Design an enzyme around this catalytic site. Structure first.
Site, PDB file in Angstrom:
ATOM      1  N   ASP A   1      38.618  45.454  42.414  1.00  0.00           N
ATOM      2  CA  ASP A   1      38.265  45.575  43.824  1.00  0.00           C
ATOM      3  C   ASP A   1      39.445  45.400  44.775  1.00  0.00           C
ATOM      4  OD1 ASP A   1      35.669  46.114  43.258  1.00  0.00           O
ATOM      5  OD2 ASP A   1      34.889  44.130  43.774  1.00  0.00           O
ATOM      6  N   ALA A   2      40.675  45.457  44.275  1.00  0.00           N
ATOM      7  CA  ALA A   2      41.814  45.162  45.143  1.00  0.00           C
ATOM      8  C   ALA A   2      42.144  46.333  46.064  1.00  0.00           C
ATOM      9  CB  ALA A   2      43.026  44.775  44.292  1.00  0.00           C
TER      10      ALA A   2
END
Lengths: 57, 77
Positions: free
Chosen positions: B59-60
């Site tokens: 999810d970065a």
């Protein structure tokens, strides 16, 4: 184990008829060996067929 | 004027691509997590710990992109 699979051989079912694998000598002079075994067997095959089940040898 | 015509497309592309990436990656990971659990319950908690380790790296970049999408849609548009 940590999980399981289920083969027929692993789980009981109601006994309608039974099988026996009987081991016996090929030669005499063994003394009382064979007949003690065969009478012990016959007693229990009798006990089973007192409950209607058959035997297969 | 003409700026507001573009700005929202320039945002929506960013955010839709981030959505595609995040959802697909997280599903690809979560499937391997689940069917692993179903093998060995009471390994569930350790696997969930490690799944939450790994999800944080997925999810970065999608979340950077969502932040910039919200920047454009409200700091500019």
């Amino acid at each position: 184990g940590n999980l399981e699979y289920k083969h027929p051989y692993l789980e009981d079912r109601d006994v309608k008829r039974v099988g026996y694998l009987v081991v016996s000598t090929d030669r005499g002079l063994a003394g009382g060996l064979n007949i003690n075994l065969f009478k012990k067997l016959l007693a229990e095959m009798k006990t089973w067929t007192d409950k209607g089940v058959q035997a297969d040898l | 004027n003409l700026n507001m015509d573009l700005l929202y497309m320039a945002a929506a592309v960013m955010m839709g691509l981030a959505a595609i990436g995040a959802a697909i990656g997280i599903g690809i990971l979560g499937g391997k997590f689940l069917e692993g659990a179903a093998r060995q319950p009471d390994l569930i908690p350790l696997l969930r710990t490690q799944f939450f380790i790994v999800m944080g790296l997925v999810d970065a970049i999608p979340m950077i992109a969502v932040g910039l999408g919200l920047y454009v849609m409200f700091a500019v548009a």
